[PDB]
Amino acid sequence: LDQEKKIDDDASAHDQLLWAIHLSGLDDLLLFLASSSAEEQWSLHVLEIVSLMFRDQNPEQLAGVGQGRLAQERSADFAELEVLRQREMAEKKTRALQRGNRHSRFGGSYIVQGLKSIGERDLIFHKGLHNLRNYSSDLGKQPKKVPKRRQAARELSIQRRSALNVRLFLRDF
């Protein structure tokens, strides 16, 4: 859990292990054991080795690997960076409009005459005039603790693009 924070296109410990298998040539021995009719007794073992080897990969993404991938992935990384930045800028501008251009201790209170409060009296609004354009009663409410039984299941791992050498080796394998 400490060192699973590796960023994509980097050699994780599993990637380095697969590279060790590749350079040692045990991968070819696994192919031999899988193709051999005489040594069929080790089929379940070889299947488990291959499963743990291809643990992290996605088939279509792996099949798309090839010679010209470095330029493609570099340009894709730059474009995705700009897309993320533009989204964050848009959200920041929307929040800056939702709050006013006055500091938070700048006072002022309003009565929204049509809106009845939880009682019969008219709603008194304190969170600034800017918020009444998109007023909602849950502006200041704390969300609720989902109890342990009702907590939704979460996906067990993030996907990371492994090292390109290991991806090419796994494609060839």
Partner 1 sequence: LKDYALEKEKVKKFLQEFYQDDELGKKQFKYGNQLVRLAHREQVALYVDLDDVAEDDPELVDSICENARRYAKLFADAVQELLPQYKEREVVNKDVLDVYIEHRLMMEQRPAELMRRFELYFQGPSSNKPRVIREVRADSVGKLVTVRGIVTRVSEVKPKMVVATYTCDQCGAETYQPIQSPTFMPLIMCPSQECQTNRSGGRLYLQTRGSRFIKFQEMKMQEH
Binding site for partner 1 (CB under 8 A): 109, 111, 117-119, 121-127, 140-142
SS3 152: coil
Contacts of 132 (CB under 8 A, 6+ apart): 110, 112, 125
Contacts of 126 (CB under 8 A, 6+ apart): 109
Nearest residue (CB) to partner 1, 128 versus 164: 128
CB atoms < 10 A from the CB of 165, how many?
Answer: 13
Nearest residue (CB) to partner 1, 118 versus 152: 118
Burial class (CB in 10 A: 0-12, 13-18, 19+), 162: buried
Nearest residue (CB) to partner 1, 5 versus 106: 106
Nearest residue (CB) to partner 1, 87 versus 126: 126
Q: How far is the CB of 135 from partner 1 (least distance, A)?
A: 13
**Beta strand segments in the chain, E:** 110-116, 122-125
Q: How far is the CB of 145 from partner 1 (least distance, A)?
A: 15
Q: How far is the CB of 144 from partner 1 (least distance, A)?
A: 12
Nearest residue (CB) to partner 1, 64 versus 108: 108
Q: How far is the CB of 141 from partner 1 (least distance, A)?
A: 7
**Beta strand segments in 37-102, E:** none
Q: How far is the CB of 137 from partner 1 (least distance, A)?
A: 9
